[PDB]
Assembly symmetry: D2
């Protein structure tokens, strides 16, 4: 009921134990190290709580406008929490490498891994063991978003039939581009345009040929199923329409989360290099540092497909108009 | 020690208990409410830890360049932590007023008060408390033991350059002001435009009134009693001196210390403002249970300069004279 | 052609240090010019966005598609304002003595400092309590409908307010009456006498709150007094949107109100940051200031007299629980 | 004298020309595109101005505590300007890819290149104007911040053999420290821990070989892993060891701000490359493949980090009690 009892500050403000102070050789900056890590872990619990509720909302065959708005609110909340965590790195960077060296002797996160897994970081790229097992077995946000995207209204052949209208629009647009390039007076400009239209033909081949798409998914360049990519492309085309404005905001927030997780990884790896360099006494070489540098690759970006959707764009007047 | 054992996550990640979930009427945003408050309390413990160490360092007759640098490191760390706490308000603002209304039924901080007291928020300024004996002892000690405001004043009073036998800054400053203002009167007398001439002469008179408030200790003492100033006359002399020679290596780090104290003060007001806007967005000026707009109006009164601890430091630029008017450093 | 497109031969030719001209150069004068010109470029952008939002609101029909574009442009202004608040610490890098060495070349302003800053204040809807092109600009910004006036007209036409249709205001008054009656009966059953009286005193405070909105004469008195700006029907529409903000129909109109409040808050955050910088550079008064009159004027701009959408901030005072709010039928 | 005359707003507020509005097919977001770019260019002119003054201050045989403080003020100012410019990307990201596509038909920076060159981005890792050609020529010929910082680092007091002789004392401290570590690892009761420590001490010996053998350092400079001269790296290491001492606190802050500038230029490059992919993808109509996008992704590599050596200085650190104490 009262502030301290409600927030359980007798439990929370009792979890700070400096091992340098315990060994009667105290290092002042060890308190900062503990608090910073515990602030991260509190916000990790919050991110997991939000993610689990969004997963339960996405694990339904019908996701109405009302549930969609609540998913957008919670994805945006996670975006704000991630920005706060990126800003916590410069606070720990206040500690000197020599101060850190004086308590390092007494020294990853279950919650960070649960976030990676629940978001959709692919594994091929006892209470704690059960938690990690369930986070890999149960559907991630990447899987649940794909199923949502696959059921996007406008994709069905009987209804709006977007993919078929898009292939036809592309064909007529590229034909008009070839005729325009043929009328180019300068020969150099004419050839540049014709070579460019050929590059466009290759781009559309990667989406209009399911075999080419499946090859890229197996290769690791794509994660999304063919139909989820169709739904994602459709939403990006009609994002200015009220029907698709909120679904697009959902995709946008997923990309913002992905980008912010990489911004944390980068800020963390720069802090590691400022504190202990590429290697230091106890590191056993630069293996740990080099591992952290490999987490900055696109193999760790979950919604990798969403970032490239603008490659497939056609002008407003080339896009098939909404009928319904 | 392993990660979870070192950080005591079995204790830390077990302090979250939603009373709406307990009463089988759960409100999802109650988890956010608890975590946000607990993140504030973790950083409050950090701020207190830093403040206590800076206080212990300032509680000495000799504060060398090396201790000064460590005080600046820790003050700057607090500045970063305060910016982080100002940014936590928009996260809680994500909660809707109707969601908050559904768990408010089950509902200030000892640590926030310890920060206010240790920084130097004067007990006689608080606009119109804790039953625990450990909490009562904490608040008693924070009021009895010297605050950062008291310790900084003693440091400022002992600033080398103030002593009459040595550099004698205050006497050289009064002489510089007198000659500068006389030269301004002669320059204003040769003004061709009559309107500009009178404006300059009226302006030089406003300057004379400013210097009266610092060169007459009785006028200063009146402002301290009035509440417009907190600093002792000699601490204000030292603060003014540091701001004049801030570009000199001797005074660059002391000036950075004053600057960080002002930044902390400004950031505490930025939190107070952000908090009061969030309170109005959640429950308005008054709501069912509030018993009027008393609580909201109290929070609006904490935005006044009666709550700014290093109030004197903000005004130091009012006493500034040009580079060519300032007495040069000899030693 | 990058340089030709952006007209960098015109843009990068507008920087002239008068200290360098007088053969007594001050390095930080370049920062002073660039910082001010960065502000003025973003002021031109804010005015451009505000004028387009005003044109979109100056219509009897504002569809979902135009509403979304208004929200995009209001949010863009919110980002530009946050960026301008962050430009103050860059100018605060300059020392007061460096500033003092070039301040001589500056003129103090006859009325408003920046024409563009005043055009923003006027176009948003501030009551602010010198050339023919500039005079015409400021005249038109005061005469033509501000964002405050145009938003009020939009709020007045909110679907759900009409008596023939949903009739929200009448259902709200009835819900309040029954809610407060239930609260009185609940307070009457309180065993502790101190708690019972607290609840009955509190219900009386609530009765007064609802009197200020359910009696148009009490509302009109507060508008004349300056405590409120909104018309009675605009406040009804604003209250309605805040009650059903979780419903898709009212989620975007609520986002529009939210962004207007964010802009208002950010303009006050700039005013505060600017006033702190002024005090760090020249104090409350300095040579040329002629007393602390200019500084004290800047401190008076921090009051709620300068907040345009003042009514929107207090809307949560009128809230009733989820189960007390009349359900949406249509 | 007056506000508009002083800031030349008749010139500044007249440089905005939308080509979509000119062609009677206006795109509202083109105004944002112009203003955002012009805001970048105004701050580029400021960064160049600060860099040129810091270069003039570093182009002296004597850099006293007073000049050092002014260099730190201006480096920290550039750090704030760079943070501001990283935050301008999300404002342009407000524009939709389809709105951008409707004016892209009417469409790098001389100032961005001048910053890259003046900071020290090596040309071994386009403009036909005569004024622009002279500018880029001079930015490559005149000493960059990387060259001038190296010269300053080389003359760091405490490195001279006659004086404090830091490098010789550091080699001796390392030798005794690592020997003590071997003796301590030999007495390890657990065999797994004993072997781990001995393997680790060997990794440390290889680290110190790269700094105590000038031939190994020169090989890394030629290989591209390092840029700094051997003596500049000695000075940089020395400052990082005694950063808590008043004598070295401000020189260390200077190195720290150079790394912050480097990191912020990479944060802009990353934010810019994400915005490009959100607007036009890896390739689009007119791009002629994904060459431009792939070029921008290659600018995120450590080949574009100027003060690359400064980031790794913590690899050479020894404990407080192992560092030779300051005498003077
Ligand atoms: C003094 C500063 C820090 C240093 C030097 C540091 C160093 C390292 C190193 C070397 C690793 C690689 C794994 C290993 O070899 O053990 C690592 C991983 C990790 N650290 Fe840090 N760390 C620091 C601060 C933090 C903070 C403040 C957090 C936040 C809670 C954090 C969270 C993690 C996580 C979650 C991983 C795993 C990353 C992944 O799997 O991609 N570290 N750290
Ligand atoms: C749902 C959001 C919040 C609301 C509506 C709210 C409301 C209030 C109110 C009405 C008061 C006045 C005292 C009273 O009458 O009980 C108050 C005081 C206070 N609250 Fe908040 N609060 C919120 C969030 C927070 C957060 C996140 C913190 C941070 C830990 C916080 C810290 C405080 C402190 C320290 C005071 C005392 C301020 C002073 O003495 O100057 N509040 N709050
Ligand atoms: C060196 C820093 C600055 C100082 C000391 C300063 C000082 C002042 C003062 C004293 C006034 C009051 C009007 C007068 O009596 O002349 C004022 C007004 C104003 N200044 Fe600043 N200023 C500074 C920087 C800026 C910047 C960077 C901007 C942004 C473009 C700015 C914009 C304005 C505006 C728009 C007003 C009018 C405010 C209102 O009407 O509410 N100032 N300034
Ligand atoms: C609509 C948004 C933008 C898009 C799609 C975009 C796209 C591109 C592309 C594709 C390139 C590669 C060169 C080429 O093939 O022509 C490039 C380079 C460049 N752009 Fe952007 N850009 C955008 C906004 C900006 C902004 C706001 C600035 C800031 C002034 C900027 C500054 C630059 C610079 C300086 C380079 C060269 C980078 C380097 O040499 O490392 N761009 N841009
Ligand atoms: O003072 C009460 C409160 C309770 C718990 C934490 C907290 C933080 N700030 C205010 N807090 C308020 C009083 C007003 C209504 C909402 C609860
Ligand atoms: O992996 C170790 C570690 C231990 C404790 C907290 C923490 C956070 N991130 C990494 N942490 C590192 C390994 C390298 C030296 C320093 C301890
Ligand atoms: O290189 C072109 C360009 C032109 C103008 C400004 C600008 C900023 N960054 C890149 N800019 C791009 C290239 C890709 C097509 C669209 C224009
Ligand atoms: O009114 C003067 C002024 C002139 C030029 C730029 C500017 C910005 N804001 C105020 N400015 C003030 C008056 C007081 C001394 C400092 C300049």
């Amino acid at each position: 009921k009262i502030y301290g009892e409600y927030l359980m500050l007798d439990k929370l403000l009792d979890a700070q134990c400096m091992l340098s102070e315990e060994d009667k050789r105290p290092v002042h900056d060890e308190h900062l190290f503990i608090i910073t890590h515990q602030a991260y872990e509190l916000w990790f619990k919050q991110i997991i709580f939000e993610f689990d509720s969004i997963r339960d909302m996405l694990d339904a065959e019908v996701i109405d406008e009302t549930k969609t708005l609540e998913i957008v609110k919670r994805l945006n909340r996670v975006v704000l929490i991630l920005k706060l965590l990126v800003d916590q790195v410069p606070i720990l960077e206040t500690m000197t490498p020599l101060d850190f060296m004086d308590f390092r002797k007494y020294l990853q996160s279950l919650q960070f891994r649960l976030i990676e897994n629940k978001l959709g970081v692919l594994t091929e790229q006892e209470e704690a063991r059960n938690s990690i097992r369930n986070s890999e077995k149960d559907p991630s946000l990447l899987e649940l978003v794909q199923r949502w995207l696959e059921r996007t209204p406008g994709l069905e052949e009987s209804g709006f039939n977007f993919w078929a209208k898009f292939q036809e629009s592309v064909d007529r647009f590229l034909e008009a581009q070839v005729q325009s390039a043929m009328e180019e007076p300068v020969e150099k400009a004419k050839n540049y345009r014709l070579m460019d239209i050929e590059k466009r033909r290759e781009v559309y081949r990667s989406i209009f040929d399911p075999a080419v798409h499946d090859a890229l998914v197996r290769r690791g360049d794509r994660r999304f199923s063919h139909r989820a990519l169709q739904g994602a492309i459709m939403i990006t085309f009609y994002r200015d329409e009220p029907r698709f404005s909120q679904p697009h905001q959902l995709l946008t927030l997923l990309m913002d989360i992905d980008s912010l997780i990489t911004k944390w990884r980068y800020n963390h790896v720069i802090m590691v290099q400022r504190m202990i360099g590429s290697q230091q006494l106890g590191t056993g070489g630069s293996s740990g540092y080099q591992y952290l540098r490999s987490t900055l690759s696109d193999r760790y970006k979950v919604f990798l497909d969403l970032f490239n959707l603008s490659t497939f764009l056609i002008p407003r007047e080339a896009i098939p108009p909404l009928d319904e």
